[PDB]
Amino acid sequence: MRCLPDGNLLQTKIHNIGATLVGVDKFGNKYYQKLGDTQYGRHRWVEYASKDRYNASQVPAEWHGWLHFITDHTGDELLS
């Protein structure tokens, strides 16, 4: 139902189609990648656990580097 008022979330749902789940963090945020080349091969995004009241600061440090393409290690590999 959140897709109707929140068009930002709808864009993620459409682009989630066919993506690979990479991991889930301690807050429940889900991390997806496509492995294509559309914006120069950058296809990493996060589906926040809270469908409302989501915030960019909710991404933990172990997944922050992966999300911003600073590192290729996922949050799971950094925690290990």
């Binding site: 930002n8 926040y48 440090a61 922050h64 580097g65 393409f69 600073i70 590192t71 290690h73």
Partner: protein, 165 residues
């Protein structure tokens, strides 16, 4: 000059031909994919060198790295750092006050370069907008909190960047 070349420009002017190409090339990107990032679900790329929110670090034992040398305070081009120090009860040379005015700071990274023990660093965080001026007067406890929160990413960037500095 010549009736053909006179006719050539007269028709080109009347029929607005050069404005046809302008329309044609404006339409080609219409059906092409867009470059817009779906913030905040998607983010722009950054490097391990990115100069963002400051953080104070500790050793893996929990001891502070900072030894109150005041090199970062001396080099800071904006005079954004204020430090007080004295000998700790166990004899250690430690700060009792470490303040960074995030509103004076110019995010140059000179403090990180000056520090001899890798205590002060500019982390990867750039999303820390506040509703009050006061919250941007970072004290020692806030900076050590930032280091605790971002330690795993900071240590990874430091390992990657160690081969260059």
């Amino acid at each position: 000059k010549d009736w053909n070349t006179v006719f050539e420009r007269s028709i080109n002017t009347l029929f607005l031909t050069e404005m046809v190409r302008g329309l044609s090339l404006t339409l080609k990107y219409f059906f092409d994919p867009k470059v817009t990032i779906n913030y905040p679900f998607e983010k722009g790329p950054l490097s391990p060198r990115f100069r963002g929110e400051h953080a104070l670090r500790r050793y893996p034992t929990g001891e502070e790295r900072c030894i109150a040398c005041k090199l970062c305070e001396a080099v800071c081009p904006a005079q954004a750092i204020t430090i007080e120090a004295e000998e700790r009860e166990d004899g250690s040379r430690r700060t009792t006050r470490y303040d960074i005015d995030m509103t004076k700071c110019i995010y140059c990274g000179f403090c990180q370069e000056a520090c001899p023990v890798d205590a002060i660093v500019e982390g990867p965080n750039f999303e820390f907008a506040t509703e009050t001026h006061e919250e941007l007067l970072y004290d020692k406890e806030k900076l050590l909190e930032n280091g605790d929160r971002w330690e795993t990413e900071i240590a990874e960037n430091l390992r990657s960047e160690s081969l260059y500095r």
